[PDB]
Design an enzyme around this catalytic site. Structure first.
Site, short mmCIF file in Angstrom:
data_model
loop_
_atom_site.label_atom_id
_atom_site.label_comp_id
_atom_site.label_asym_id
_atom_site.label_seq_id
_atom_site.Cartn_x
_atom_site.Cartn_y
_atom_site.Cartn_z
N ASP A 192 0.84 -1.19 0.00
CA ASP A 192 0.00 0.00 0.00
C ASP A 192 0.88 1.24 0.00
OD1 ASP A 192 -2.01 1.98 0.34
OD2 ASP A 192 -2.15 1.65 2.50
N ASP A 214 -0.45 4.95 0.91
CA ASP A 214 -0.81 5.75 2.07
C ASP A 214 -0.79 4.92 3.35
OD1 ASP A 214 -2.16 8.38 3.16
OD2 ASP A 214 -3.38 6.72 3.92
N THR A 232 -2.68 1.01 -4.42
CA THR A 232 -3.10 2.13 -3.59
C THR A 232 -4.41 2.70 -4.12
OG1 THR A 232 -2.61 4.42 -2.97
CG2 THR A 232 -1.54 3.55 -4.95
N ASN A 233 -5.21 3.23 -3.20
CA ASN A 233 -6.41 3.99 -3.54
C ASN A 233 -6.00 5.45 -3.66
OD1 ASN A 233 -8.14 1.84 -3.70
ND2 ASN A 233 -9.13 2.19 -1.72
N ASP A 238 -2.03 -0.70 5.59
CA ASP A 238 -2.27 -0.13 6.91
C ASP A 238 -3.72 -0.26 7.36
OD1 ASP A 238 -3.14 1.78 4.94
OD2 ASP A 238 -3.00 3.38 6.44
N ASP A 245 39.05 12.09 -13.40
CA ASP A 245 40.23 11.63 -14.14
C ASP A 245 40.43 12.59 -15.31
OD1 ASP A 245 42.33 9.50 -14.39
OD2 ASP A 245 41.26 9.11 -16.27
N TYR A 282 53.53 4.79 -16.42
CA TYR A 282 52.66 4.15 -17.41
C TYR A 282 52.31 5.10 -18.54
CZ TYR A 282 48.88 6.82 -15.33
OH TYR A 282 48.08 7.84 -14.87
N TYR A 329 46.25 10.86 -23.95
CA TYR A 329 47.57 10.96 -23.35
C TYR A 329 48.62 11.49 -24.31
CZ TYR A 329 45.96 8.06 -19.42
OH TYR A 329 45.31 7.57 -18.32
N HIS A 350 40.92 4.97 -6.88
CA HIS A 350 40.80 5.88 -8.03
C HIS A 350 39.36 5.97 -8.52
CE1 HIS A 350 41.73 7.94 -11.76
NE2 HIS A 350 41.15 6.96 -12.44
C1 LIG Z 1 51.57 20.17 -15.77
O1 LIG Z 1 51.94 18.99 -15.06
C2 LIG Z 1 51.24 17.84 -15.31
C3 LIG Z 1 50.20 17.73 -16.22
C4 LIG Z 1 49.58 16.51 -16.43
C5 LIG Z 1 50.00 15.38 -15.73
C6 LIG Z 1 51.05 15.49 -14.82
C7 LIG Z 1 51.66 16.71 -14.60
O2 LIG Z 1 52.65 16.90 -13.67
C8 LIG Z 1 52.34 17.71 -12.54
C9 LIG Z 1 49.36 14.02 -15.90
C10 LIG Z 1 48.83 13.68 -14.51
C11 LIG Z 1 47.73 12.65 -14.55
C12 LIG Z 1 47.63 11.69 -13.55
C13 LIG Z 1 46.64 10.73 -13.59
C14 LIG Z 1 45.72 10.72 -14.62
N1 LIG Z 1 44.80 9.66 -14.58
C15 LIG Z 1 44.88 8.48 -15.25
O3 LIG Z 1 45.70 8.29 -16.12
N2 LIG Z 1 43.95 7.56 -14.93
C16 LIG Z 1 43.96 6.22 -15.51
C17 LIG Z 1 44.38 5.17 -14.52
C18 LIG Z 1 44.41 5.44 -13.16
C19 LIG Z 1 44.82 4.49 -12.24
C20 LIG Z 1 45.21 3.24 -12.69
O4 LIG Z 1 45.62 2.27 -11.76
C21 LIG Z 1 44.68 1.70 -11.00
F1 LIG Z 1 43.67 1.30 -11.72
F2 LIG Z 1 44.21 2.52 -10.09
F3 LIG Z 1 45.14 0.65 -10.37
C22 LIG Z 1 45.19 2.95 -14.04
C23 LIG Z 1 44.77 3.91 -14.94
C24 LIG Z 1 45.81 11.68 -15.63
C25 LIG Z 1 46.81 12.65 -15.60
C26 LIG Z 1 46.91 13.69 -16.68
N3 LIG Z 1 48.33 14.00 -17.01
C27 LIG Z 1 48.60 15.04 -18.06
C28 LIG Z 1 48.46 16.40 -17.43
MG LIG Z 2 -3.35 3.04 3.35
#
Ligand SMILES: COc1cc2c(cc1OC)[C@H]1Cc3ccc(NC(=O)NCc4ccc(OC(F)(F)F)cc4)cc3CN1CC2
Ligand SMILES: [Mg+2]
EC number: 3.3.2.10
Length: 548
Positions: A9, A11, A123-124, A185, A335, A383, A466, A524
């Site tokens: 229900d 109300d 419900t009504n 109710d 991110d 990376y 990137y 993250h």
């Molecule tokens: C002007 O100085 C900068 C400028 C800049 C950057 C760095 C600089 O220096 C100060 C770097 C910084 C940065 C850092 C992280 C990310 N995020 C990302 O890549 N996420 C993907 C991911 C996250 C975690 C992971 O691992 C796990 F999954 F957690 F296990 C696996 C993948 C992006 C950026 C951007 N950049 C360029 C700009």
């Molecule tokens: Mg009722």
């Protein structure tokens, strides 16, 4: 024998306080004879005004005059005089407005549906054509999505406790009496159900009724841990497509009304990564627009690297607003999305009502150092060098999509990746399992959604974000004399071992009125690791900074 369907229900059960209970206190306040409002409410019985209202034969606005006469007729028999301020319109306006959702009840209903039950509301109710009918409309919409069926009395032309409606209920549920439990109710509404053979629970207090419903269903509903926010079903969402320019169309998902809030996901994610935020933000009174960023999912993915530099990605988002008719929009990013919304505020502040970022800080450009030197001066960003060469990082991630996302979307305490030894070992997944275990943050179905999304355009587009280090740096240097002076929010995640909260310690230099939020024990993937805390921070910040 074994229960399978559950009916609730409105109300008095799913919504509190009941309308009869607010009508009773009104009787006390204005000092009427006891029950006089309910005698007028029920004058005529199955052929009275209220039943004609509950059956859809007349609207609510038509029923108020009939309720006024019934109150003048009932006050005449009891030998009393109604006050000079008597207003049935105003009395019921307060009752309908004070009615809120019984969250322990709805959460129990969700648990049953999760375990495989068919949930419905019986419900009504009435056809509400009041000027304030929207208040009741919002209530119904947020309850409707959580149930398989909503059987309203005025829609079907049948009212409780008439036996015909219970036969209509059983036909809708496609189940037998002994397979359905029914909560109400009012004890009168249970006798016809109890006659057909279905289980009945008289709901006086919520916690006792839940104890009874625990027993007959064998499922724990009371004292259940805190449930996750409502998630999104992709096939039930509104899917939008805007062509920002030739060969580039952006896909987004839309929900709710109000100030436009535009969500931008990160790498390697999708609009689905906001699945816990989208309904919560729309419920708070916002029109969410969750994007598929350029290169992701149903959005276009041109192969050229320069198509993913920050200057191009930002001009296209501006275009996306233009072709939708939006002068502004709140930009919330995470991110790479978070970095893009920072530069949205820096280059197009007139189109950003407010900007917020999860994990990603605003690191201003260094005019005396290329970004490649800074990335090399940090072993956690190693990376990103592996991503630079086209085709290399693509082959590893596109090899096994299931293994790719199962190894990434992991909580802070489940990590199977070492971001500081990528270039040396020659791969992101070199020392990770071939069939990683399913994290606590994502189900197998949710992982298989990401797989299907990235079967479309692969990983080239995403990785190209990137590969514009030098281009983005030249662009950002044009804004080194500016300051972000619009409403801004920086949310940091404790256990993000890449975008650490300490990277954001100097941001106030550039954003003087910056507001902050912190989430603990969070990795993250902020949106799916701690969705309840993300929703709280954002809805609070939006209601105070973005709205008017
Ligand atoms: C002007 O100085 C900068 C400028 C800049 C950057 C760095 C600089 O220096 C100060 C770097 C910084 C940065 C850092 C992280 C990310 N995020 C990302 O890549 N996420 C993907 C991911 C996250 C975690 C992971 O691992 C796990 F999954 F957690 F296990 C696996 C993948 C992006 C950026 C951007 N950049 C360029 C700009
Ligand atoms: Mg009722």
């Amino acid at each position: 024998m074994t229960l399978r369907a559950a009916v609730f229900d409105l109300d008095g059960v799913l919504a509190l306080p009941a309308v009869f209970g607010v009508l009773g206190r009104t009787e006390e306040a204005l000092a009427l004879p006891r029950g006089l409002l309910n005698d007028a409410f029920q004058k005529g019985g199955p052929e009275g005004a209220t039943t004609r209202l509950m059956k859809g034969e007349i609207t609510l606005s038509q029923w108020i005059p009939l309720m006024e006469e019934n109150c003048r007729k009932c006050s005449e028999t009891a030998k009393v005089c109604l006050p000079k301020n008597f207003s049935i319109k105003e009395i019921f306006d307060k009752a309908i407005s004070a009615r809120k959702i019984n969250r322990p009840m709805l959460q129990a209903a969700l648990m049953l549906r999760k375990k495989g039950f068919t949930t419905a509301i019986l419900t009504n109710t009435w056809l509400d054509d009041r000027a304030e009918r929207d208040g009741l409309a919002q209530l119904m919409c947020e309850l409707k999505m959580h149930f398989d069926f909503l059987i309203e009395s005025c829609q079907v032309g049948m009212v409780k406790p008439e036996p015909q409606i219970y036969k209509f209920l059983l036909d809708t549920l496609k189940a037998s009496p002994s397979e359905v439990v029914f909560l109400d109710d009012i004890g009168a509404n249970l006798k016809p159900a109890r006659d057909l053979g279905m289980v009945t629970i008289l709901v006086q207090d919520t916690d006792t009724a839940l104890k009874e419903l625990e027993k007959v269903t064998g499922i724990q509903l009371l004292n259940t841990p805190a449930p996750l926010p409502t998630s999104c079903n992709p096939s039930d969402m509104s899917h939008g497509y805007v062509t920002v320019k030739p060969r580039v169309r952006l896909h987004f998902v839309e929900l709710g009304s109000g100030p436009a809030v535009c969500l931008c996901h990160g790498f390697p994610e999708s609009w689905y990564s906001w699945r816990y935020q989208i309904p919560a933000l729309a419920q708070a009174g916002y029109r969410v627009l969750a994007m598929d960023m350029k290169g992701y999912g149903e959005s276009s993915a041109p192969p050229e690297i320069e198509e993913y530099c920050m200057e191009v990605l930002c001009k296209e988002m501006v275009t996306f607003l233009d072709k939708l008719g939006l002068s502004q929009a709140v930009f919330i990013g995470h991110d790479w999305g978070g970095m893009l919304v920072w530069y949205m505020a820096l280059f197009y502040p007139e189109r950003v009502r407010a900007v917020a970022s999860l994990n990603t800080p605003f690191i201003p450009a260094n005019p005396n150092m290329s970004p490649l030197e800074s990335i090399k001066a940090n072993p956690v960003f190693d990376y990103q060098l592996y991503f630079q060469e086209p085709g290399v990082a693509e082959a590893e991630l596109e090899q096994n999509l299931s293994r790719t996302f199962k190894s990434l979307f992991r909580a802070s305490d489940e990590s199977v990746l070492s971001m500081h030894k990528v270039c040396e070992a020659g791969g992101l997944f070199v020392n990770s399992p071939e069939e990683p275990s399913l994290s606590r943050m994502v189900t197998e179905e949710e992982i298989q959604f990401y797989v299907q999304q990235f079967k479309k355009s692969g990983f080239r587009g995403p990785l190209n974000w990137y590969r514009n280090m030098e281009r983005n740096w030249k662009w950002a240097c044009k804004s080194l004399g500016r300051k972000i002076l619009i409403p801004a929010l920086m949310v940091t995640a404790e256990k993000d071992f890449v975008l650490v909260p300490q990277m954001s310690q100097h941001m106030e230099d550039w954003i003087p009125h910056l507001k902050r939020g912190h989430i603990e024990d969070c990795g993250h993937w902020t949106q799916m690791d701690k969705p309840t805390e993300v929703n709280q921070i954002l809805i609070k910040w939006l209601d105070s900074d973005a709205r008017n």
